[PDB]
Design a protein around this ligand. Structure first.
Ligand SMILES: Nc1ncnc2c1ncn2[C@@H]1O[C@H](COP(=O)(O)OP(=O)(O)O)[C@@H](O)[C@H]1O
Lengths: 111, 191, 214, 188
């Protein structure tokens, strides 16, 4: 929708820093919410990552494209599979030192 | 012409469907076209003996009609569009058609289902529908609820095997125990 | 296995019109499914190509970010997170009408209100930071393109599934049900014509007997 | 059988449309099945009095038939994708079936629509359709054009509301001004 104008980033620290340098993600002052939240495997937990992804997909209506790390998506594979709705889109970008896995991609799995 | 004149003169239509005659679904009473104009005069007998009989019967008719509409919808455009409550309606109506309506007249148990046994079975099936509806409205997923309450569903479907020869007092106690255990199981599944 | 239609000549004509319309719709929808499936094959091929492009672009963007961090001597992630008051990059959905569908395609945009990056206060490596920012902006544009393509893929697949389901539903229910209703109505009309013929034959026999008597 | 014989032996036949009657659209005359074999012989009177009447009624018949086929396709395939020309065709046909074809017999204004008034209304409707088609062929977006020309569409709809008792001289002057400003309104 036209309301969804943002690029959510839930990838690793390096990928989150790169996205922030690009300017895709930001923290809304009035809403006290960050479009791009830095999260790693050690940081927070799998349940916290899944909750953040669900909030970005549904609660964060402004989010249009979601960028999640492949390592992060591995622990959130169930959430990725459950996110069958086209909007917001999900991109299976991988983190540092981890090659992208076509099999692990949820969108490519439908093929 | 004979059928039309007979329907013009008679008051009760126990129409039979051959699609149900096949696949051994006797009695094959076509619940849609069938009617009975004696329900209004039988309301007095029902109030005298089994007060909840008309309301349970109307609930069963509503369930069957709603599930017939949903069956047309699912045959047209699949089952993905149907809501949770639609899924419960379809499942409970299939249960009713398979267990309650389908009565084998040549088995020992279902050769003669008396009025009290029929009333108890409607109470059990309608209570199962109501409990599933309430549990789903509470937020429980229907698939998980069905997986957990398959035992209760099988107990409800197996209520047709209760011998009417055991007497009204003994079987009605069995139906009361079935309803109590059903309520406990649904509460546990919801919790 | 039929429709509850009252056998009449008008009803027969209505059911023939329904059968003709259902056949036309079935042919049209089968052809539309074929065209949409060709578009879908093109879409999935572009998805594979964009996935490879995403892999190479993310690899080079990670390399550039690592080089910028090494040049600066510290992780700029904290500074970037601090300077996240507003987003200079935004995506606007565009209702691109490919074939008959209206799949939404995202269109990237750049907001100059907060276009300033975190180069200031980074300590050192300003040129490296700017190069990394440009590489990340190119990666973000590629990400927007890939997300638009994936959303188009999902919408197109859903529409194709619905259309194929409706084609099968027509061909296996509506056409057979309407054909059966046509056959039954024709049979009942023939039965009425035969009954009228027998009644007229009885009348003719009575008239002939009366003529013989007279 | 009586209808079959009457159609076989008649020259004009105004057929009933059950669909139009069930919509309470009056008069409920089915355009597809109806006919009149007096168009050719009446071409003389039309050329003598209202020269553009035959081509206008042929244009409206073509519009109605094209939009009937397009509406069948719409009811079949959802009308998700339609060209600008096709959208104009359906919109113009709906406008015709609501304003020109439909009329209230008991209403004061539309109790008896004269022949000159009917010719002027055909002029208005056909000119609207042709100018919209020309604009769409130029490259204008149909949605924006309709948003801008809702006023002109309302004017050509109120052409039905135009009173016939004002006389042929005054009313035709009004229709002359109606499509005069209609041409200029499509420049934007
Ligand atoms: N209530 C029932 N329980 C079991 N079988 C039944 C029942 N009703 C009908 N049937 C079966 O249907 C078969 C056909 O008998 P029926 O249909 O009653 O004769 P008719 O063709 O005269 O109606 C029988 O063989 C019987 O086994």
């Amino acid at each position: 929708a036209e309301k969804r104008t943002l690029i959510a980033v839930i990838a690793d620290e390096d990928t989150t820093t790169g996205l922030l340098l690009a300017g895709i993600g930001q923290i809304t002052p009035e809403t006290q919410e960050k479009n791009f939240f830095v999260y790693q495997e050690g940081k927070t937990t799998k349940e916290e990552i899944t909750d953040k992804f669900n909030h970005f997909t549904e609660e964060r209506d402004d989010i249009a494209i979601l960028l999640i790390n492949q390592h992060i998506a591995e622990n959130i594979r169930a959430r990725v599979d459950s996110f069958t709705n086209a909007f917001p889109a999900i991109l299976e970008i991988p983190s540092k030192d981890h090659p992208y896995d076509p099999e692990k991609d949820s969108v490519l799995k439908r093929v | 012409p004979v059928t039309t004149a007979t329907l013009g003169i008679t008051q009760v239509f126990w129409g039979l469907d051959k699609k149900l005659a096949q696949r051994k679904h006797f009695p094959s009473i076509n619940t849609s076209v069938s009617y009975s104009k004696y329900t209004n005069v039988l309301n007095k007998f029902y109030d005298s003996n089994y007060p909840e009989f008309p309301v349970l019967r109307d609930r069963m008719k509503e369930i069957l009609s709603n599930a017939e509409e949903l069956e047309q919808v699912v045959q047209l455009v699949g089952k993905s569009a149907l809501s949770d409550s639609d899924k419960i309606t379809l499942d409970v109506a299939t249960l009713i058609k398979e267990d309650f309506l389908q009565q084998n007249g040549y088995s020992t148990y279902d050769a003669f289902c008396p009025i009290w046994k029929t009333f108890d079975m409607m109470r059990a099936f309608i209570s199962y529908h109501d409990e599933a509806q309430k549990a789903v409205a509470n937020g429980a997923n229907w698939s998980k609820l069905a997986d957990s309450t398959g035992d209760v569903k099988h107990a409800v479907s197996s209520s047709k095997f209760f011998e009417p020869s055991r007497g009204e007092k003994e079987v009605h106690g069995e139906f009361e125990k079935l309803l109590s255990t059903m309520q406990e199981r649904f509460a546990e599944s919801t919790d | 296995n039929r429709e509850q239609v009252f056998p009449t000549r008008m009803t027969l004509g209505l059911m023939k019109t329904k059968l003709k319309g259902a056949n036309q719709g079935y042919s049209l929808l089968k052809r539309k499914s074929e065209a949409l499936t060709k578009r879908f094959r093109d879409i999935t091929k572009r998805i594979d190509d964009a996935k490879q492009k995403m892999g190479r672009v993310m690899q080079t963007a990670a390399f550039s970010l690592a080089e910028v961090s090494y040049a600066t001597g510290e992780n700029i992630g904290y500074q970037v997170q601090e300077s996240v008051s507003t987003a200079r990059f935004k995506v606007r959905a565009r209702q691109e009408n490919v074939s008959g569908v209206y799949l939404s395609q995202f269109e990237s945009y750049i907001d100059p209100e907060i276009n300033d990056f975190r180069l200031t206060g980074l300590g050192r490596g300003g040129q490296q930071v700017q190069r990394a920012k440009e590489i990340y902006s190119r990666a973000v544009e590629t990400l927007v393109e890939l997300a638009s393509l994936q959303t188009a893929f999902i919408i197109l697949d859903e529409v194709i599934k619905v259309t194929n389901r409706r084609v099968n539903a027509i061909e296996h229910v509506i056409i057979p049900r309407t054909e059966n209703t046509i056959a039954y109505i024709n049979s009942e009309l023939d039965e009425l014509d035969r009954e009228e013929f027998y009644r007229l034959k009885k009348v003719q026999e009575k008239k002939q007997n009366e003529t013989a008597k007279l």
